[PDB]
């Protein structure tokens, strides 16, 4: 399988 | 702010 | 007799 | 994905 | 902050 | 199969 | 001839 | 996964 996820939360 | 992200999942 | 079978399961 | 299989049964 | 996530993949 | 999960996030 | 077989796969 | 197979060839 293949998975790609990106998360760049800012405050 | 600045954000740069790249994702190239392959299968 | 003769037999030929191929199986390439992927996940 | 990639798959290559050959079968030539003879009788 | 508060976060709640559940993942139960099966095969 | 069987699965049981509980999540009660508070803020 | 006589044959007896049982299979109960579970998931 | 689950698999169940039976084969009783006779001659």
Curated annotation (Swiss-Prot), chains A, B, C, D, E, F, G, H:
Family: Belongs to the transthyretin family.
Gene from which this protein is expressed: Ttr
Tissue specificity note: Detected in serum and cerebrospinal fluid (at protein level). Highly expressed in the choroid plexus. Detected at lower levels in the liver.
Additional note from the record: This protein binds retinol-binding protein at levels similar to, and the thyroid hormones at levels much higher than, the human protein.
Role description: Thyroid hormone-binding protein. Probably transports thyroxine from the bloodstream to the brain.
Record's subunit section: Homotetramer. Dimer of dimers. In the homotetramer, subunits assemble around a central channel that can accommodate two ligand molecules. Interacts with RBP4.
Location in or out of the cell: Secreted
Protein name, UniProt field: Transthyretin
Source organism of the structure: Rattus norvegicus (Rat)
């Amino acid at each position: 399988y293949t998975i790609a996820a990106l998360l760049s939360p800012y405050s």
